[PDB]
Design a protein around this ligand. Structure first.
Ligand SMILES: Nc1nc2c(ncn2[C@@H]2O[C@@H]3COP(=O)(O)O[C@H]4[C@@H](O)[C@H](n5cnc6c(=O)[nH]c(N)nc65)O[C@@H]4COP(=O)(O)O[C@H]3[C@H]2O)c(=O)[nH]1
Ligand SMILES: [Ca+2]
Ligand SMILES: [Ca+2]
Lengths: 262, 95
């Protein structure tokens, strides 16, 4: 028989096991990365993938959506993002040793901008694996750069000096989103799905995208679209001058880097 | 596969299936079939104290090879919050 008062008391303890599991994953290979190909829409494509974090326990695979609320509550997000960046650079070393010129796009949050461990991890790991910094691309949401601007600017200078590319995701939903860029010059912009999802059907979105790409190109800023799921979206992005696309129309996320770039 | 279905006979089965620490709530669903993390799935869920089938358009956040199956995160719309509210109220012991 279900005892509700007993379940209520067992919760606190269920959370503690999760936290310990997360702390234990910060050490080893319990975390892993899967990879989503990011394809150049306009010309010869770089071998570029985006990394996605998973947690694996005895053959079970978990999305960050299973554990990120716990991680946030226990202030583990900055450590987790350091783990991903270290692992990614290790992967770039592995690819390079096998003859591949692979690039990886990785997510970091705004508390990484003032994390001295993040900057150190990037420098030290790139040197351990002999990876050129240009191979590592780091993305953070536009909204979070706005709210952490001064640390974002300092991070951007430190990391750009190592040749890594720093860019924004969830970009462009806002009146003149290009106005942040007067204060933060990114290597790339990934457009918010709110703009790109209905691009085939909403001229409202079609105008916003051409507005963004006409401002990006003359500044040499790359633009990118994600969740690209159909051919009419590809067609609209192509005409609007978007540089990169990713999503199920191109390729799913998976454990292997076996995408033939075309 | 099409329509996923899960009927939970009793509160113990619910307690065991429910993911209380996922944003918006989630639930474990048995299925032998192959899903990828982030797939959108449609699930009809039946809860212990009623015959009403509750529709859930959720996202895959967990894969296991006890059972083979998927963890499904509820969406943030009113339909997702509704099903979460009903589960959490049940497991609190309430009418
Ligand atoms: N971004 C993106 N996703 C696509 C695309 N096509 C299909 N998907 C799938 O759709 C889900 C979208 O989640 P998100 O907004 O990136 O939201 C993500 C993100 O919030 C978080 N997350 C995933 N990977 C990482 C990571 O490496 N670092 C951090 N900090 N968070 C991550 O977990 C959520 C769920 O990730 P998944 O379970 O992997 O599930 C992902 C992904 O597998 C695409 O073009 N772009
Ligand atoms: Ca409780
Ligand atoms: Ca911390």
């Amino acid at each position: 028989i279900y005892d509700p008062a007993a379940a209520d008391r067992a919760e606190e303890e269920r959370i503690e096991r999760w936290v310990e599991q997360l702390r234990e994953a910060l050490v080893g290979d319990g975390f892993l990365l899967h990879y989503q190909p990011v394809l150049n829409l306009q010309g010869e494509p770089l071998e570029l993938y985006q990394a996605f974090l998973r947690l694996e326990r005895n053959g079970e695979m978990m999305s960050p959506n299973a554990f990120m609320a716990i991680a946030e509550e226990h202030d583990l997000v900055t450590e987790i993002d350091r783990w991903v960046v270290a692992r990614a650079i290790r992967q770039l070393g592995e690819r390079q040793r096998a003859g591949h010129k692979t690039h990886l796009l990785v997510r970091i949050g705004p508390n990484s901008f003032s994390d001295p461990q993040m900057i150190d991890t990037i420098r030290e790991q790139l040197a351990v694996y002999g990876v050129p910094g240009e191979r590592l691309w780091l993305q953070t949401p536009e909204s979070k750069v706005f709210t952490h601007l001064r640390n974002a600017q300092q991070f951007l200078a430190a990391v750009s000096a190592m040749d890594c590319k720093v860019g924004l995701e969830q970009f462009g939903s806002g009146l003149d989103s290009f106005q942040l860029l007067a204060h933060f010059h990114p290597a790339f912009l990934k457009l918010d799905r709110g703009i790109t999802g209905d691009i085939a059907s909403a001229r409202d979105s079609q105008e916003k995208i051409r507005e963004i790409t006409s401002r990006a190109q003359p500044a040499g800023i790359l633009t990118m679209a994600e969740f690209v799921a159909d051919a009419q979206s590809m067609s609209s992005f192509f005409s609007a001058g978007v540089d990169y696309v990713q999503g199920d129309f191109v390729a799913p996320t998976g454990p292997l880097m076996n995408y033939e770039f075309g | 596969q099409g329509i996923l279905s899960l009927a939970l006979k009793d509160k113990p089965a619910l307690y065991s299936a429910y993911m209380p620490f996922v944003k918006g709530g989630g639930i474990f669903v048995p299925t032998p079939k192959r899903y990828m993390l982030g797939d959108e799935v449609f699930l009809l869920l039946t809860l212990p104290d009623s015959s009403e089938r509750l529709p859930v358009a959720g996202k895959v956040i967990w894969t296991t090879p006890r059972a083979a199956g998927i963890g499904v995160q509820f969406p943030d719309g009113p339909e997702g919050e509704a099903v979460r509210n009903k589960i959490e109220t049940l497991l609190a012991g309430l009418t």
